[PDB]
Amino acid sequence: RILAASFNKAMTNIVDAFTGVNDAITQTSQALQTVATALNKIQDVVNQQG
Amino acid sequence: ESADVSEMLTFDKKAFTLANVSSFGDYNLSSVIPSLPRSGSRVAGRSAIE
Amino acid sequence: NSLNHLTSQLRQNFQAISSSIQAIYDRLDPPQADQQVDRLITGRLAALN
Amino acid sequence: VFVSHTLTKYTEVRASRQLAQQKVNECVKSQSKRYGFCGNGTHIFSLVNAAPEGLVFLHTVLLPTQYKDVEAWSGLCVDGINGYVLRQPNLALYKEGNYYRITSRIMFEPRIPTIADFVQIENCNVTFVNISRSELQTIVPEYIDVNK
Amino acid sequence: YRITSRIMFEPRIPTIADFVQIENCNVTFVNISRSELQTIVPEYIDVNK
Amino acid sequence: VFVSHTLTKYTEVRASRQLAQQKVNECVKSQSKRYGFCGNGTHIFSLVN
Amino acid sequence: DILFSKLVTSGLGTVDADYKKCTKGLSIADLACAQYYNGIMVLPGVADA
Amino acid sequence: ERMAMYTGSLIGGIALGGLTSAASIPFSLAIQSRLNYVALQTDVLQENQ
Amino acid sequence: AVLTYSSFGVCADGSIIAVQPRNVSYDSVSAIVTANLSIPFNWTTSVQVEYLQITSTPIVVDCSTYVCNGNVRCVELLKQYTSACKTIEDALRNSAML
Amino acid sequence: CNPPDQLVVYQQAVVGAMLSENFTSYGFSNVVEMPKFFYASNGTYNCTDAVLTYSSFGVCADGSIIAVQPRNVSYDSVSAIVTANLSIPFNWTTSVQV
Numbered sequence A: 001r002i003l004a005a006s007f008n009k010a011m012t013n014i015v016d017a018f019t020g021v022n023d024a025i026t027q028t029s030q031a032l033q034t035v036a037t038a039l040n041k042i043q044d045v046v047n048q049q050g
Numbered sequence B: 001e002s003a004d005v006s007e008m009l010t011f012d013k014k015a016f017t018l019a020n021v022s023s024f025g026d027y028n029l030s031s032v033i034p035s036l037p038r039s040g041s042r043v044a045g046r047s048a049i050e
Numbered sequence C: 001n002s003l004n005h006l007t008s009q010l011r012q013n014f015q016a017i018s019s020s021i022q023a024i025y026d027r028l029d030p031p032q033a034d035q036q037v038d039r040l041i042t043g044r045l046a047a048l049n
Numbered sequence D: 001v002f003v004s005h006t007l008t009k010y011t012e013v014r015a016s017r018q019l020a021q022q023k024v025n026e027c028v029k030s031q032s033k034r035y036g037f038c039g040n041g042t043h044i045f046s047l048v049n050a051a052p053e054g055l056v057f058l059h060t061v062l063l064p065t066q067y068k069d070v071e072a073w074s075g076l077c078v079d080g081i082n083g084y085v086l087r088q089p090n091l092a093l094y095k096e097g098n099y100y101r102i103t104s105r106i107m108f109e110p111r112i113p114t115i116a117d118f119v120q121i122e123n124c125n126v127t128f129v130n131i132s133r134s135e136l137q138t139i140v141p142e143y144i145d146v147n148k
Numbered sequence E: 001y002r003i004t005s006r007i008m009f010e011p012r013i014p015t016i017a018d019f020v021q022i023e024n025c026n027v028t029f030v031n032i033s034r035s036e037l038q039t040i041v042p043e044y045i046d047v048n049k
Numbered sequence F: 001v002f003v004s005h006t007l008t009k010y011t012e013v014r015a016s017r018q019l020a021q022q023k024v025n026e027c028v029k030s031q032s033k034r035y036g037f038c039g040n041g042t043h044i045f046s047l048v049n
Numbered sequence G: 001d002i003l004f005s006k007l008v009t010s011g012l013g014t015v016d017a018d019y020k021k022c023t024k025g026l027s028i029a030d031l032a033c034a035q036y037y038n039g040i041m042v043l044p045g046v047a048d049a
Numbered sequence H: 001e002r003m004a005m006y007t008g009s010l011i012g013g014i015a016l017g018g019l020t021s022a023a024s025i026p027f028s029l030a031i032q033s034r035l036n037y038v039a040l041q042t043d044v045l046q047e048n049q
Numbered sequence I: 001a002v003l004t005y006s007s008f009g010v011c012a013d014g015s016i017i018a019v020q021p022r023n024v025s026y027d028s029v030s031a032i033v034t035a036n037l038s039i040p041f042n043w044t045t046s047v048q049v050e051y052l053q054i055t056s057t058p059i060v061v062d063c064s065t066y067v068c069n070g071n072v073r074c075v076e077l078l079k080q081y082t083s084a085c086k087t088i089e090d091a092l093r094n095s096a097m098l
Numbered sequence J: 001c002n003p004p005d006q007l008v009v010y011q012q013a014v015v016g017a018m019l020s021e022n023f024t025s026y027g028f029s030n031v032v033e034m035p036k037f038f039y040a041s042n043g044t045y046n047c048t049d050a051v052l053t054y055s056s057f058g059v060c061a062d063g064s065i066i067a068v069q070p071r072n073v074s075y076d077s078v079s080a081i082v083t084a085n086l087s088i089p090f091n092w093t094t095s096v097q098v
């Protein structure tokens, strides 16, 4: 039960980090840091084809 | 290039304090352990191999 | 493919009288031939790069 | 110049595509014990989703939050002539109150000691638990000294 | 008799927990009786019989 | 031309950097049983400088 | 869909052209059809949605 | 500076044995534990160290 | 720090500060010894994200149209560069197929 | 006036052509409409195997264009620890992959 509750909380913060509603507090966790790194790499690819 | 290199460079103060030559007993590891900071303002220096 | 591209680049004139270095020195005095040979030198070094 | 730009990018994508296929086979389809390949902790499972020009992985790992201290022992020495060590090197024998228990060193999984959990060796250590055949029941509840 | 690891020579006294029972035997197996199994497994006591 | 030289070198470094991270996680921190990844024999421990 | 809309839409990037519309002339050619007139053909993405 | 802290932490991690209160273990025990990962050690006196 | 490069970083107000490595607790190989051992007892679930590119939009160019713009007289001059168009078109087509 | 087209070659023969107009060009007798181009071939569209493929498109030996599907495989699964009927492999075959 504790594992499931923790997983549900993490998945919510992941969607929040993809949108940007928690941008000012994303630095509080390394897990949220990986989302910033992933978004930066996707943004680079999106800005390079043309 | 500066982002993924920074992700690799992690630190552990707990494990760092075991960098003595005395922690390895009969195994001579003096050629690889960090050098003592000569005049402060830093925590470590290059080893006898670097 | 890489070798054929490098060898074929030797036939280019690079806006010179001819692609043959000997042909330039057979037609002009050294003061004028050297200026035209420099075109082949720069063009061929670009092919090597 | 354009061909040079495209060929260079195919090298970047080809390297990253092979890594993505390894992560699908080792982190998504299977469970991996290779440390650091599917996160930074103990891997459980992974999820994947489509992303622009690529894939996105959602690694699910376990991170410890609390620790338990146990007074562990290296092994048993019975009658001073019989030495015993645990069958798996990743298991540890410890004392809890008046009895003994066996746990994994990776996760705290208490287990009742059984005679099949030990491997007999030729000699003993000074650090082994001193015990006689008659009292071995206190460590292994199922043991019976039949021959005595 | 002794049991050792194939990767590194670590001798070990054979215990009944080191074996797995199977349905049939093979011609190359070591033939003993229940009465003499002690020679291979020193801790084996024939409770039955 | 200079941009081409730098990008091509970054391809070499990016591939070698990923291998270095794998060797830190599998040979330096943990003990590896993957044959040939951390030498040619049975791996015990690895150091880095 | 978040990762495909939240990020900048690649309208100015590599989007394949409707060749069936580029030669009809019923509207002035967009960026995709304009490149087709210069022989540049962006093939459909192998990663079909 | 960061390199010395990075390599120094990794070298010191080999001496960690998971003891309570972070107490360091003799390095002979660390080698013995890594040897056990290869094969279950039966040499009790550890002469090969 | 919101923007970083090597050992330097800047925060929201623009002050420059020195960046430090992330704190991590290294895992340790539990020793087989008579001592006091610390063993993980409670666990939490953490989700981490990784992005890997697997494809790039293939592009093929018709050499005759790009350089000659469909001029009939130009394509006749292009035929003298026998290995030019063939090498470019082959390189792009093979990469797209593979 | 003359935008570029693409020709599909298979076993030293032209089996089809991709066109921007609804014309039976290059002598082909059949033309079909695809989402982003017209396709001219000579074939009858009574096939399911593709000899040449690109992305979601493939062509049969007679030149008919069809939509290619992912390869069907059976994924391996972790056998759960539970009281129920379980399926366990019983027979095995040897396969060589290059």
Ligand SMILES: *[C@@H]1O[C@H](CO)[C@@H](O[C@@H]2O[C@H](CO)[C@@H](O[C@@H]3O[C@H](CO)[C@@H](O)[C@H](O)[C@@H]3O)[C@H](O)[C@H]2NC(C)=O)[C@H](O)[C@H]1NC(C)=O
Pocket: A029, A030, A031, D040, D041, D063, I023, I024, I025, I026, I027
């Ligand atoms: C794997 O990743 C985690 C996630 O970042 C690594 O860091 C550890 O993360 C937790 C939080 O997720 C930290 O907990 C916090 O620590 C401070 C310590 O003073 C405390 O004030 C907070 O209340 C909270 O407990 C944990 O300490 C942190 N580790 C360190 C050394 O800071 C984890 O270390 C990684 N593990 C591996 C094996 O790579």
Ligand SMILES: *[C@@H]1O[C@H](CO)[C@@H](O[C@@H]2O[C@H](CO)[C@@H](O[C@@H]3O[C@H](CO)[C@@H](O)[C@H](O)[C@@H]3O)[C@H](O)[C@H]2NC(C)=O)[C@H](O)[C@H]1NC(C)=O
Pocket: J072, J073, J074, J075, J076, J095
């Ligand atoms: C690894 O590759 C092999 C082939 O090299 C895959 O085997 C194929 O698996 C599929 C799905 O189980 C089989 O299809 C089924 O076959 C039966 C009998 O014809 C039919 O009744 C089903 O409706 C379906 O068609 C296929 O025949 C089989 N092929 C071979 C040659 O064995 C296997 O699935 C792959 N495994 C993994 C884990 O990727």
Ligand SMILES: *[C@@H]1O[C@H](CO)[C@@H](O[C@@H]2O[C@H](CO)[C@@H](O)[C@H](O)[C@H]2NC(C)=O)[C@H](O)[C@H]1NC(C)=O
Pocket: B028, B029, B030, B031
């Ligand atoms: C561990 O190795 C170091 C480095 O080789 C030894 O230090 C050297 O000792 C020799 C003794 O003949 C001296 O000549 C060198 O000048 C020393 N070098 C340095 C850099 O200190 C050290 O003695 C060894 N220690 C043990 C206990 O084996």
Ligand SMILES: *[C@@H]1O[C@H](CO)[C@@H](O[C@@H]2O[C@H](CO)[C@@H](O)[C@H](O)[C@H]2NC(C)=O)[C@H](O)[C@H]1NC(C)=O
Pocket: D074, D125, D126, D127, H026, H032, H044, H045, I032, I033, I034
């Ligand atoms: C086996 O016995 C040796 C001694 O013969 C043990 O080593 C001693 O361990 C204690 C506790 O760490 C140290 O204080 C002694 O100094 C050690 N003696 C020597 C000679 O090194 C060793 O720990 C035992 N090994 C096992 C696996 O139980």
Ligand SMILES: *[C@@H]1O[C@H](CO)[C@@H](O[C@@H]2O[C@H](CO)[C@@H](O)[C@H](O)[C@H]2NC(C)=O)[C@H](O)[C@H]1NC(C)=O
Pocket: D080, D125, D126, D127, D128, D129, D130
């Ligand atoms: C287990 O018993 C042995 C003796 O059979 C103990 O080892 C002796 O300990 C004393 C006290 O330090 C020494 O003087 C002897 O020389 C040791 N003898 C041997 C053969 O090692 C041992 O201390 C007991 N183990 C425990 C964990 O209490």
Ligand SMILES: *[C@@H]1O[C@H](CO)[C@@H](O[C@@H]2O[C@H](CO)[C@@H](O)[C@H](O)[C@H]2NC(C)=O)[C@H](O)[C@H]1NC(C)=O
Pocket: E026, E027, E028, E029, E030, E031
């Ligand atoms: C163990 O006993 C079996 C008894 O059958 C032996 O196997 C027989 O060996 C004899 C002599 O070669 C053959 O004629 C029989 O046909 C074999 N029977 C079987 C089982 O096929 C076996 O050789 C003995 N093994 C040892 C090592 O004692």
Ligand SMILES: *[C@@H]1O[C@H](CO)[C@@H](O[C@@H]2O[C@H](CO)[C@@H](O)[C@H](O)[C@H]2NC(C)=O)[C@H](O)[C@H]1NC(C)=O
Pocket: D071, I034, I035, I036
């Ligand atoms: C492990 O830790 C326990 C406590 O959890 C230690 O027990 C103490 O041991 C000293 C020995 O002089 C006694 O004075 C204390 O009174 C003991 N405390 C309790 C609560 O019993 C024990 O010594 C440690 N053992 C090892 C092998 O490291």
Ligand SMILES: *[C@@H]1O[C@H](CO)[C@@H](O[C@@H]2O[C@H](CO)[C@@H](O)[C@H](O)[C@H]2NC(C)=O)[C@H](O)[C@H]1NC(C)=O
Pocket: J083, J084, J085
């Ligand atoms: C597993 O399958 C077996 C049959 O292979 C099931 O056995 C049946 O169980 C029901 C229970 O109501 C009986 O009515 C049937 O007569 C049984 N069939 C046979 C052939 O004996 C069993 O229930 C299944 N069990 C699980 C746990 O999945």
Ligand SMILES: *[C@@H]1O[C@H](CO)[C@@H](O)[C@H](O)[C@H]1NC(C)=O
Pocket: B019, B020, B021, B034, B035, B036
């Ligand atoms: C090793 O540890 C001791 C602890 O007293 C300390 O004096 C010594 O300076 C340390 N070694 C180095 C090289 O810092």
Ligand SMILES: *[C@@H]1O[C@H](CO)[C@@H](O)[C@H](O)[C@H]1NC(C)=O
Pocket: D137, D141, D143, D144, D145
């Ligand atoms: C046998 O069972 C009895 C209880 O009926 C118990 O007292 C005794 O200790 C058991 N024997 C052993 C060896 O534990």
Ligand SMILES: *[C@@H]1O[C@H](CO)[C@@H](O)[C@H](O)[C@H]1NC(C)=O
Pocket: D147, D148, E038, E044, E045
């Ligand atoms: C112990 O067991 C053996 C059989 O293994 C038996 O012969 C012997 O008499 C028993 N008792 C003693 C004291 O050895």
Ligand SMILES: *[C@@H]1O[C@H](CO)[C@@H](O)[C@H](O)[C@H]1NC(C)=O
Pocket: E048, E049
């Ligand atoms: C011991 O073996 C005999 C046959 O020799 C059998 O009848 C008996 O049931 C066995 N003992 C037990 C406890 O089953």
Ligand SMILES: *[C@@H]1O[C@H](CO)[C@@H](O)[C@H](O)[C@H]1NC(C)=O
Pocket: B013, I020, I021, I022, I023
């Ligand atoms: C890492 O640990 C050091 C102390 O060892 C601490 O000063 C530092 O602030 C920690 N973390 C970061 C992210 O800087």
Ligand SMILES: *[C@@H]1O[C@H](CO)[C@@H](O)[C@H](O)[C@H]1NC(C)=O
Pocket: A002, I041, I042, I043
């Ligand atoms: C584990 O930690 C959680 C979160 O604090 C707590 O609710 C739970 O009761 C703990 N479990 C144990 C066994 O200590």
Ligand SMILES: *[C@@H]1O[C@H](CO)[C@@H](O)[C@H](O)[C@H]1NC(C)=O
Pocket: J022, J033
């Ligand atoms: C293409 O031409 C065929 C044959 O004349 C006709 O049946 C079809 O309707 C046409 N389709 C379009 C979209 O022009």
Ligand SMILES: *[C@@H]1O[C@H](CO)[C@@H](O)[C@H](O)[C@H]1NC(C)=O
Pocket: J014, J027, J028, J029, J042
């Ligand atoms: C395709 O078939 C048509 C039908 O008349 C035929 O006339 C043409 O020669 C054939 N050519 C090819 C490409 O098969």
